[PDB]
């Protein structure tokens, strides 16, 4: 199977990349994820809010109330500076990792000679 | 920073890719990781054994005693069938994820028109 922790990591990554594209609210995020996935990934609100409560508590995203021109309150989320930085540190750390793995295949092969 | 959970995920991935290259023991694994990383990643044995105890408990790797031609016992580790499969499920799930993220950038851009 795919371990829960890995799923969670995936969902995190995706959701942060939606915010990267712009401040958004629950139903916008879900729709965007559904379209970009062909409906193969349909987030719940429960899930999205459980994740965001965690990201917000750790200061990676922040929330704010939208215009009430609509006449009803809507909560928006954005990536924070720390947010942006972690996404950057993460991305780079992973590309080093992918290099290390190239090098393992390389070194293996090279000693087949 | 890079969250501990992400570091752990990285170290897992790397270690499993070493076993992928062949059955190995602690000091072989460490050396191989150190060479493929330029010494930028020097695993402890403590760490390696804490991780492997977990992987082995979850049936992703298995261990066995090496030849005692050496005259001393050495423990080897190998990836299991389940091991190989999880590495495959994982890898594929991540490439879907990377696609989803392409599609988010794509969809964003496309509606700038």
Author numbering:
A (entry chain A), B (entry chain A): 3 to 115
Question: What did the paper state?
Answer:
Remarkably, while V15aY exhibits the characteristic LmrR structure, forming an open pore at its dimeric interface of similar shape and dimensions as observed in other LmrR structures, the V15aY_RNYW_KK structure appears to be more closed and exhibits a narrowed cavity. Furthermore, a significant difference in the rotameric state of the aY side chain is observed (S11†). In the parent structure, the –NH2 group of aY is oriented towards the side of the pore, away from the central W96 and W96′ residues. Strikingly, the opposite enantiomer of product 3a was obtained when compared to LmrR_V15pAF (further referred to as V15pAF), albeit with low yield (entries 2 and 3). The results showed that directed evolution led to a 3.4-fold increase in apparent catalytic efficiency, with (kcat/KM-2a)app values of 3.3 M−1 s−1 and 11.2 M−1 s−1 for V15aY and V15aY_RNYW, respectively.
In previous work, we have introduced pAF into lactococcal multidrug resistance regulator (LmrR), a small homodimeric protein harbouring a pore that exhibits promiscuous substrate binding capabilities, either by direct incorporation using the dedicated orthogonal translation system (OTS),19 or, preferably, by introduction of p-azidophenylalanine (pAzF), followed by a post-translational Staudinger reduction. Incorporation of aY into protein scaffold LmrR gave rise to an artificial Friedel–Crafts (FC) alkylase exhibiting complementary enantioselectivity to a previous FC-alkylase design using p-aminophenylalanine as catalytic residue in the same protein. X-ray crystal structures of the parent and evolved designer enzymes suggest that the introduced mutations cause a narrowing of the active site and a reorientation of the catalytic –NH2 group. Position V15 resides inside the pore of LmrR, and is the same position of ncAA incorporation as used in earlier works featuring pAF as catalytic residue.
